[PDB]
From a paper:
Oligopeptidase B (OpB) is a two-domain, trypsin-like serine peptidase belonging to the S9 prolyloligopeptidase (POP) family. Two domains are linked by a hinge region that participates in the transition of the enzyme between two major states—closed and open—in which domains and residues of the catalytic triad are located close to each other and separated, respectively. In this study, we described for the first time the structures of bacterial OpB from S. proteomaculans (PSP) obtained by X-ray for an enzyme with a modified hinge region (PSPmod) and two of its derivatives. The enzymes were crystallized in the presence of spermine and adopted uncommon intermediate states in the crystal lattices.
Finally, the tobacco etch virus (TEV) protease digestion site (ENLYFQ*S) was introduced by site-directed mutagenesis instead of amino acids 71-77 (IPQQEHS), forming the first hinge peptide. The hinge region modification included the substitution of the functionally important residue Glu75, which, according to our previous homology modeling and molecular dynamics studies, participated in the putative interdomain SB network stabilizing PSP in the closed conformation. PSPmod was crystallized in a conformation characterized by a disruption of the catalytic triad together with a domain arrangement intermediate between open and closed states found in crystals of ligand-free and inhibitor-bound POP, respectively. In the PSPmod structure, the distances between Cα-atoms in the pairs Ser532–His652 and His652–Asp617 are equal to 18.2 and 10.6 Å, respectively, which are longer than those in the closed states of TbOpB and ApPEP and comparable with those in the open state of TbOpB and intermediate states of PfPEP and GmPEP. In PSPmod, the His-loop location outside of the active center is stabilized by hydrophobic contacts of Met648 with Leu42, Glu43 and Asp46 residues of the α1-helix from the N-terminal loop. Gln619 was unable to form a SB with Arg151 and the latter interacted directly with catalytic Asp617, the interaction restricted His-loop movement and prevented rapprochement of His652 and Ser532 and consequent catalytic activation. In PSPmod, Sp702 is situated on the surface of the propeller domain near the η4-helix. Three Sp line the surface of the interdomain cavity of the catalytic (Sp703 and Sp705) and β-propeller (Sp701) domains, and Sp704 is located between the domains. Sp703 is remarkably close to catalytic Ser532: the distance 703C11-Ser532OG is 4.11 Å.
Numbering used by the authors: 1 to 677
The structure:
C-alpha cells in the first residue's frame, strides 16, 4: 500500500588497504544531531512506522495491560543489615521513584527515611540514583544522583543527625565512591570532561570546598576503566583499573591519613585479576595460569607468593567468590550450568548447592557482612520466577526470603528443555527453551529465537513475566547460547570474537535449523530478536540465511561495523579492538568486512523486520540502523515489512522508565504476533 521514505543517496567513498567501499548514506551521521535533512529522514521513517503499525493498536493495548497486570504495585526489597542498621527499599503505587529507609538492627517498629527519590526529583526534568552509602560511623549519607540524564553523577552528603545537607557537590563523577574508616573522607572517580571516561581518583573531606580535594591517581590509558572497591576487611580501598583484557589494582590504606596508592601487581597484557582482603590475607581471582581462572591466597602483592586455592580447570569457569567466617563460596560455570560451591577454610569440606531444573541460573546475591554462616544467593529458571534464598552454610538449611510475584500465572502450565545442537564444525551448542504445554503440537508452534553472543556475556536461562505474553499465544521461546557468549566459559567467548566472530552467527543458524528439524516449531513461523551486539547477530544472520526467518526485531543494532571500527572519533571504537579487531589491519578489515551487515546487504529477499534506535544518547550511534534501513529499502527484492522506530525523547523515567519499557515490548510483540497470526 504505502510508499516508504527514500533517503537521498550521496556517494561517499572510503578506501582502506586499496579497497573502495561507496557508502550512499554516510551523511545520516550528524554528531551534532541538528542536520535538518537527517532529522527529516528519521521523523519520516517514524511516521511510516506509526502508519504501518496503526492496525495493531488494539493488540498493543491488550499486551501492555496484561504485562502491567502481572506485576505488583507495592515492591519492598528484602531487608539487609550493614554496620548495625537494617535497610529496605520501598516503591508505593503513584510514587514514580524508590524510597530508601532504615532502622537500628535491634529496632522493629519505626523506620527513618534516608532518601525519598520523589522529593529529590521535585522540579527536575530527570532523576537517577546512581549510589547510596552511609559512612561507617552511621552519621553521614553519601548519594550519587544524575539530574541531567548523561550518567555524570553529582555526589552530595547528608547529616543524618538533623537531616541537613552539606553545602558542597562533587561534580562529573562515575558515581563510584568509598568511605575511609574515619567517616570524614571519601574517595571518588572523576570522568574526563570530554570523553566522559572515568580517569581520575580524588580524596574529599566531607563539608569542605571540593577545590581543596587532592588528586590521588590519574589513569594514562583510556581503555582502562577506573573503579573503586572496599575490601571485606575494611582495611583497603581498591583503585580497580581494567581493559577488556588486562587488570591492575592499587591499594589505599582505609585507616590512616595521607594514604598514597600502593601497587598490587603491575598490568601485564591478557592477565585479568581481582582481589579482596580478609583474615590478614589477600584473595585473588586470576587467569595468570589458565583462561578459566584460578583462586589464590597471599600475604603480600608479589605474584610469586600467591598460593593456589583453586587451580584453573578447562571444564569449570571460575566467575567470582565471597568470603565468610568459616567458608569460601565460589560461583562457577560447568557443562552449561551456573553453580555455587562452598569450601571450609579449616576442614576443606566441599559442598555443591543442588537444584532440579534443566534451564536455571544461580548467583551470589548481596552479602555485606562476612561474620555469618548465612549465604544469600539468587535463583531463576524459565519456569520459576526469580527467588532469593538464605542457606545455612554449616547446616544446609535453605529458606526462601523472597519470590518474584507474577499474577495470572500458573507455573505448571509451562515446560522447559535444555537441548544441545551439534554445530556445523561438530562443536556442541546448548539451547534453553520454554513453551505452554496445552497449546504445544510438534511442527506447529511459532519460534522466537533470542541471542546476544558478544563480550563473554551469557544469556543465562531465567524467568521473564513479559515472555508469558508470547508463551500464552502458542510461542516456543528459545535462548541460543551461541559462541561469543560466556555460557561454556572463556573458551566459548574467545571462539566467537576477533578471527572467530563468524562462529556466533553460524551457531544461531545451526541451532534454529536443528530446532525446526526436531519439530520444536513451524518452519514458516520462525522469528528472532537481538539487541546492540545482538543486533549485529540479527544483521549478519539475515544477510547469510535470509530464508530461515519469517520476521526479525533488531534493537539498537551494531551493523556499520567496518566504518565505525575505522573511526576513533566514535565513542567505544578504541575499547572494542579487542572484541571485533582493528580494521586498520588488513587481516581484520577482510575478516570483519565478510560479516559487517551494512556492507553485506544484497539484492535478495529479506524477512519482515522492525529496527529500533535512539537519537539523543547512543550505545550504537543512531545513524547505523538508519543507514542500514535506507540501504535495505534500496536493494531488497521482497515486498515484506521493513520499519525503523527512532526514540526522539529527551531521556528516561523512574530509573528505567518502566511504563515506556513495557510500551516498547508491546510494540515489538504486536509486530511479531501480527506476522505469526
Amino acid at each position: 500500500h504505502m510508499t516508504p521514505p527514500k533517503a537521498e543517496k550521496r556517494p561517499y567513498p572510503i578506501t582502506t588497504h586499496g579497497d573502495t567501499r561507496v557508502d550512499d548514506y554516510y551523511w545520516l551521521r550528524d554528531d551534532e544531531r541538528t542536520d535538518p535533512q537527517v532529522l527529516d529522514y528519521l521523523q519520516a521513517e517514524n511516521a511510516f512506522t506509526d502508519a504501518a503499525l496503526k492496525p495493531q493498536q488494539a493488540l498493543r493495548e491488550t499486551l501492555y495491560e496484561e504485562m502491567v497486570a502481572r506485576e505488583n504495585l507495592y515492591f519492598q526489597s528484602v531487608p539487609y543489615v550493614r554496620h548495625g542498621y537494617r535497610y529496605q527499599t520501598r516503591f508505593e503505587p503513584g510514587n514514580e521513584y524508590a524510597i530508601y529507609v532504615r532502622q537500628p538492627q535491634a529496632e522493629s517498629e519505626h523506620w527513618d527515611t534516608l532518601i525519598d527519590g520523589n522529593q529529590r526529583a521535585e522540579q527536575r526534568e530527570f532523576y537517577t540514583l546512581g549510589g547510596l552509602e552511609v559512612s561507617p560511623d552511621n552519621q553521614k549519607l553519601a548519594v550519587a544522583e544524575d539530574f541531567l540524564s548523561r550518567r555524570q553523577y553529582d555526589i552530595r552528603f547528608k547529616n543524618l543527625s538533623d537531616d541537613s545537607w552539606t553545602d558542597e557537590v562533587l561534580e562529573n563523577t562515575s558515581g563510584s565512591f568509598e568511605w575511609a574508616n574515619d567517616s570524614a573522607t571519601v574517595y571518588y572517580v572523576r570522568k574526563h570532561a570530554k570523553t566522559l571516561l572515568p580517569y581520575q581518583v580524588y580524596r574529599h573531606v566531607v563539608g569542605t570546598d571540593p577545590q581543596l580535594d587532592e588528586l590521588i591517581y590519574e589513569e594514562q590509558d583510556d581503555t582502562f576503566y577506573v573503579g573503586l572497591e572496599k575490601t571485606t576487611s575494611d582495611r583497603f580501598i581498591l583503585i580497580h583499573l581494567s581493559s577488556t583484557t588486562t587488570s591492575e589494582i592499587l591499594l589505599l590504606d582505609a585507616d590512616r591519613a595521607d594514604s598514597t596508592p600502593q601497587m598490587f601487581v603491575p598490568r601485564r597484557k591478557d592477565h585479568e585479576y581481582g582481589i579482596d582482603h580478609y583474615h590478614q590475607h589477600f584473595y585473588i581471582r586470576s587467569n595468570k595460569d589458565g583462561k578459566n581462572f584460578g583462586l589464590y591466597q597471599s600475604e603480600q602483592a608479589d605474584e610469586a607468593q600467591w598460593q593456589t586455592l583453586i587451580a584453573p580447570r578447562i571444564e569449570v569457569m571460575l566467575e567470582g567468590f565471597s568470603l565468610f567466617r568459616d567458608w569460601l563460596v565460589v560461583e562457577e560455570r560447568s557443562e552449561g550450568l551456573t553453580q555455587l560451591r562452598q569450601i571450609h577454610w579449616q576442614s576443606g569440606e566441599v559442598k555443591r548447592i543442588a537444584f532440579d531444573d534443566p534451564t536455571y541460573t544461580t548467583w551470589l546475591a548481596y552479602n555485606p557482612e562476612p561474620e555469618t554462616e548465612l549465604l544469600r544467593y539468587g535463583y531463576s529458571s524459565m519456569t520459576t520466577p526469580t527467588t532469593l534464598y538464605e542457606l545455612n552454610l554449616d547446616s544446609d538449611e535453605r529458606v526462601m526470603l523472597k519470590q518474584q510475584e507474577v499474577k495470572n500465572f500458573t507455573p505448571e502450565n509451562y515446560r522447559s528443555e535444555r537441548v544441545w545442537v551439534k554445530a556445523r564444525d561438530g562443536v556442541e551448542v546448548p539451547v534453553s527453551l520454554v513453551y505452554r504445554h496445552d497449546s504445544f503440537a510438534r511442527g506447529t508452534n511459532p519460534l522466537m529465537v533470542y541471542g546476544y553472543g558478544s563480550y563473554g556475556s551469557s544469556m543465562d536461562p531465567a524467568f521473564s513475566a513479559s515472555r508469558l505474553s508470547l508463551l500464552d499465544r502458542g510461542f516456543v521461546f528459545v535462548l541460543a547460547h551461541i559462541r561469543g557468549g560466556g555460557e561454556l566459559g572463556q573458551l566459548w567467548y574467545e571462539d566467537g570474537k576477533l578471527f572467530k566472530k563468524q562462529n556466533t552467527f553460524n551457531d544461531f543458524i545451526d541451532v534454529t535449523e536443528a530446532l525446526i528439524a526436531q519439530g520444536y516449531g513451524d518452519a514458516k513461523r520462525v522469528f528472532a530478536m537481538g539487541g546492540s551486539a545482538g543486533g549485529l547477530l540479527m544483521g549478519a544472520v539475515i544477510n547469510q540465511a535470509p530464508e530461515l526467518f519469517n520476521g526479525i526485531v533488531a534493537q539498537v543494532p551494531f551493523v556499520d561495523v567496518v566504518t565505525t571500527m575505522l573511526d576513533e572519533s566514535i565513542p567505544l571504537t578504541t575499547g572494542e579492538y579487542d572484541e571485533w579487531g582493528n580494521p586498520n589491519q588488513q587481516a581484520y578489515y577482510d575478516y570483519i568486512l565478510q560479516y559487517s551487515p551494512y556492507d553485506q546487504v544484497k539484492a535478495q529477499d529479506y524477512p519482515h523486520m522492525l529496527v529500533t534506535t535512539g537519537l539523543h544518547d547512543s550505545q550504537v550511534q543512531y545513524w547505523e540502523p538508519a543507514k542500514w534501513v535506507a540501504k535495505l529499502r534500496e536493494l531488497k527484492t521482497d515486498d515484506r515489512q521493513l520499519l525503523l522506530y527512532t526514540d526522539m525523547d529527551s531521556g528516561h523515567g523512574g530509573k528505567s522508565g518502566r511504563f515506556k519499557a513495557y510500551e516498547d515490548i508491546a510494540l515489538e510483540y504486536a509486530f511479531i504476533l501480527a506476522l505469526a497470526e
